[PDB]
C-alpha cells in the first residue's frame, strides 16, 4: 500500500510524565500446617456372621403299598423329619456313638412313636456317609428304606427311621436375632442367646421348654471316637430338628466395622473446619470435620479401637522406631463417605450404624485433584514472583536508557508515535501525526553542504518545504543534522519500503525491505492448549452379568414351577 510517514511538530512542554515506581511483589503464602502419622481405615461390615452348628434329626418315612395282580403300586409315602431329644443326645450319641431306632416326637399336639421296620428298638451305630469330603460331614444309620407288599388285593405299611447328624454352617445377619442353617432352616433365636450373663436379653420366639444349655460339655467326635475339649454348648428343640451349637459371647464375635486398609504414612492437613487424610501410597484422600467421633454412638464398635492399637504399635515399632515419636493417644474421625479413620499422630525428632458407600473413586479423585491443584498453584506462584522480580529489574534498563534515545523508547510505551524530551528528571512528550496525501516527496542526491567540503549532512535532505529525513519515517522540517564529512561514507536509510543506500554522501541505489536479512530479538515460546475429551461410561460388567453368576435364580424357578397345574392340567372343568 501507500507508505506511511510521520511529522513531528516542535514539542510543547505541557504534557509531562515520569516512569511508574517499581511495584511490590506479591507473596502467595502457600504451605500447609500439616501433621503426619499412621492410620487404619475401617468400613461397614456387611457379611453375615458365620459359625458352625450341628443338626440332630431322625427321618420318618411311612410307605403304603398295594400288591396288585402282577405289580406293586405305592399309594402313599409320608416323609417327615423329627428332632432327637437332648436326653438321647447326651446319653446315647455322645456317650457311645449310637442312636436309637425308636423315633419319639410330637406332632399335632400328641405324643407319637414310630419304629424302624416295625421291629423292636435297637441302638444302631452311626456310620459316616459316603460323601464326607471335608466341608460337609454327616453320619447316618441306615442305607436302606423299608416297605412290604403283602398278599394281592391288600395294603401294607412300612416305616423307616434313620438317625441323621450333620455338621452345618449356620449364618446370621444384623441385628442377630435369627440364624439360618445350611439345610434351609430358619431358627428363630439369636445365636448368642443363653440363660446366663445377661444373654436372656437376646431375642427368641421359642418357648423356654426347648432350650438347654451345658457347660464343660465334651462333645463326641464321631469319627475318631474321642471327645473334644470342654466348651459350653447350647441345644434347641425345633418341631423338626435339634440344633446344637457352642455358645460364644456376643461382644467378641460380631462387629459393625471391619478393617479395610492399614496405611503406614498419612498426612493430616487442615482446611477451614475440615481435615484431609492424604494417603499418598493408596492415592486416596479422606475428609473429616474437625471434631472427634465417639464410636460409642455406633452399635457394636468395640473391636475397632483396641484392634487398631495392636496394629499401630506394630507399625510404629517396625518402621517409625528411631525416626519419630508419638503425640498422644489415637483419634477417631468419621471420614466422608462412611469410613472410620483411626489416626495416631507422630512427630519427628526435631445408637446407629455407619453406612459405607460402594466406591472409593470419589476419594481417588479428591487426591488426584489435590495433587495437581497443589502443584499447579505452586508453579503459577513461582512464575508471578519471578515475573515481578524481572520487571522491577527491567525498569532500571529503561530509566538508564531514556537519556540516550528518548523518543523511540517512549513511543514503544505509549503505543503511539510521540516525540519526547528530557526536562531534567522527567519526560515531556508531544504527538507526531501522520502526513496526509497530495504531497510530493523528493529525495535529494548529495549529502554535502554546498561550498563547505569538509562539512556534510548526517541524514539525507528531502524536498517536501526543504527539510531532511529523520528516522522511522519521521520527517524533519529543518536541515540541522550535520557532521564532519568523512570518507568511506557508506550508509543506508529506511525510506517508505525501500532502504536507500548512499555512498560518499551521494545517491547510489535503493533496495527493498525483505531483501535485507533479519536478526531476531524475539525469543520463542510455543505454548499449546489442552484438547477436549469425552469420557465414556466404561462398565466392566453390566447388572445383568452380575446377576448371572448363580446356579439357580429363585424367582426364575418359581415363575416356572408355580404354573405347573396351569400348563399341564385343565383346572376349569368340573365333574358332576
Amino acid at each position, epitope marked *: 500500500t501507500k507508505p506511511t510517514f510521520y511529522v513531528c511538530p516542535p514539542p510543547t512542554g505541557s504534557t509531562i510524565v515520569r516512569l511508574e515506581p517499581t511495584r511490590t511483589c506479591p507473596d502467595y503464602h502457600l504451605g500447609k500446617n500439616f501433621t503426619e502419622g499412621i492410620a487404619v481405615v475401617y468400613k461397614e461390615n456387611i457379611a453375615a456372621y458365620k459359625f458352625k452348628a450341628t443338626v440332630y434329626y431322625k427321618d420318618v418315612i411311612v410307605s403304603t403299598a398295594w400288591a396288585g395282580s402282577s405289580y406293586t403300586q405305592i399309594t402313599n409315602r409320608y416323609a417327615d423329619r423329627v428332632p432327637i431329644p437332648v436326653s438321647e443326645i447326651t446319653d446315647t450319641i455322645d456317650k457311645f456313638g449310637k442312636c436309637s431306632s425308636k423315633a419319639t416326637y410330637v406332632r399335632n399336639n400328641h405324643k407319637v412313636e414310630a419304629f424302624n421296620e416295625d421291629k423292636n428298638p435297637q441302638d444302631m451305630p452311626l456310620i459316616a456317609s459316603k460323601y464326607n469330603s471335608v466341608g460337609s460331614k454327616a453320619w447316618h444309620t441306615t442305607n436302606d428304606t423299608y416297605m412290604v407288599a403283602g398278599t394281592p388285593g391288600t395294603y401294607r405299611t412300612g416305616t423307616s427311621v434313620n438317625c441323621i447328624i450333620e455338621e452345618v454352617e449356620a449364618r446370621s445377619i444384623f441385628p442377630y436375632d435369627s440364624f439360618g442353617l445350611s439345610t434351609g432352616d430358619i431358627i428363630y433365636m439369636s445365636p448368642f442367646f443363653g*440363660l446366663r450373663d445377661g444373654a436372656y436379653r437376646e431375642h427368641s420366639n421359642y418357648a*423356654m*421348654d426347648r432350650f*438347654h*444349655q*451345658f457347660e464343660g460339655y465334651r462333645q463326641r467326635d464321631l469319627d475318631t471316637r474321642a471327645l473334644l475339649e470342654p466348651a459350653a454348648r447350647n441345644f434347641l428343640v425345633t418341631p423338626h430338628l435339634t440344633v446344637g451349637w457352642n455358645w460364644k459371647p456376643k461382644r467378641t464375635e460380631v462387629c459393625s466395622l471391619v478393617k479395610w486398609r492399614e496405611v503406614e504414612d498419612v498426612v493430616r492437613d487442615e482446611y477451614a473446619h475440615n481435615f484431609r487424610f492424604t494417603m499418598k501410597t493408596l492415592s486416596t484422600t479422606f475428609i473429616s470435620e474437625t471434631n472427634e467421633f465417639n464410636l460409642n454412638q455406633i452399635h457394636l464398635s468395640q473391636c475397632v479401637k483396641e484392634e487398631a492399637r495392636a496394629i499401630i504399635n506394630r507399625i510404629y515399632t517396625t518402621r517409625y522406631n528411631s525416626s519419630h515419636v508419638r503425640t498422644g493417644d489415637i483419634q477417631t474421625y468419621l471420614a466422608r463417605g462412611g469410613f472410620v479413620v483411626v489416626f495416631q499422630p507422630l512427630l519427628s525428632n526435631s445408637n446407629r450404624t455407619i453406612t459405607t458407600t460402594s466406591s472409593v473413586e470419589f476419594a481417588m479423585l479428591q487426591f488426584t485433584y489435590d495433587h495437581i491443584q497443589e502443584h499447579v498453584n505452586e508453579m503459577l506462584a513461582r512464575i508471578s514472583s519471578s515475573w515481578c522480580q524481572l520487571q522491577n529489574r527491567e525498569r532500571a534498563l529503561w530509566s538508564g536508557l531514556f537519556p540516550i534515545n528518548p523518543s523511540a523508547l517512549a513511543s514503544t510505551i505509549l503505543d503511539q508515535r510521540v516525540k519526547a524530551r528530557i526536562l531534567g528528571d522527567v519526560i515531556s512528550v508531544s504527538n507526531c501525526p501522520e502526513l496526509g496525501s497530495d504531497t510530493r516527496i523528493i529525495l535529494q542526491n548529495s549529502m554535502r553542504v554546498s561550498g563547505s567540503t569538509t562539512r556534510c549532512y548526517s541524514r539525507p535532505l528531502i524536498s517536501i518545504v526543504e527539510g531532511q529525513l529523520g528516522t522511522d519515517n519521521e520527517l524533519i522540517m529543518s536541515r540541522d543534522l550535520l557532521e564532519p564529512c568523512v570518507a568511506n561514507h557508506k550508509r543506508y536509510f529506511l525510506f517508505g519500503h525501500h532502504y536507500v543506500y548512499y555512498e560518499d554522501y551521494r545517491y547510489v541505489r535503493e533496495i527493498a525491505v525483505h531483501d535485507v536479512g533479519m536478526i531476531s530479538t524475539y525469543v520463542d515460546l510455543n505454548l499449546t492448549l489442552l484438547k477436549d475429551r469425552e469420557f465414556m461410561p466404561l462398565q466392566v460388567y453390566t447388572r445383568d452379568e452380575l446377576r448371572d453368576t448363580g446356579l439357580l435364580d429363585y424367582s426364575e424357578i418359581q415363575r416356572r414351577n408355580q404354573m405347573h397345574s396351569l400348563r399341564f392340567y385343565d383346572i376349569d372343568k368340573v365333574v358332576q
Partner: antibody
Amino acid sequence: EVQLQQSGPELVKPGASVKISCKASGYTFADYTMHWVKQSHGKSLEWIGYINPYSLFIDSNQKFKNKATLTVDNSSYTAYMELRSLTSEDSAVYYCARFPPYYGFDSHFDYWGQGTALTVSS
Amino acid sequence: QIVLSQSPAILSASPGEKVTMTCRASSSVSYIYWYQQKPESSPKPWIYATSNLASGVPGRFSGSGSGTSYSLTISRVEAEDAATYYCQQWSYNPYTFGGGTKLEIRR
C-alpha cells in the same frame, strides 16, 4: 426315694482340715451335679461350688476359692468337700443339694441334704 | 455379687388374708426362684422358674415378677407357713440367695 445322707456333726481345732461327705441314694448318681452351700449361725445362705460327677467339672464361688475343694467317689456315689485353712468364722451348718446338669428353666435345687454342722473352736 | 433384696424383712399376717413379698435384684435375672426353710431343718425347693409351683406345694402360693422385680403372694395365709422364704438365682456366677423373710401369725 431320693435321699442325701450327710456326714453329720463335727468339731475341729482351727488350722486343721475336714472332709464332709454327701452320700446319695435314690437316683442314678452320675448325671446330677452336686452343689454345696453355707448357712452361718442365723445368717443368710451362701453358694459355694459344685462338681459334675460325670465329667469332673468344677465351678466355685471365688469368695470360697481357697477354703474348699471338691471330689467325687465314683464307687460309693458320694461327694466330698474338703476344707483347708480353717477359721473361726466357718462355724456354720452346711448342706449339699442336687441340681440338673443343664441350665434350663426346670433346674433348681430339688433335693437337699439333711445338713451337717461344723464348729471351729478348741 | 448380684444382690437380691427381699424387701419385707418380717411379714406379719393375720391367718386367712393375703400377703406379698418382693425380691429386688441389682441387675436383671432371667429367672428368680424361691426356697423356704422351717427352722432347724433343710431348705425346700419351693418355686422354680418364677411362676411354677413346686411338686408338692399348696396352690394358694403365687410367685410372679420379671426383670428386676419379683413378687410372691400367698392367696390365703395359713399358720402352717412360718418359714424363711429365700429368693435365689443362678443367672450370674456366683449364685446368690436373698436375705430372706420370715412369716408371722397374729395370735
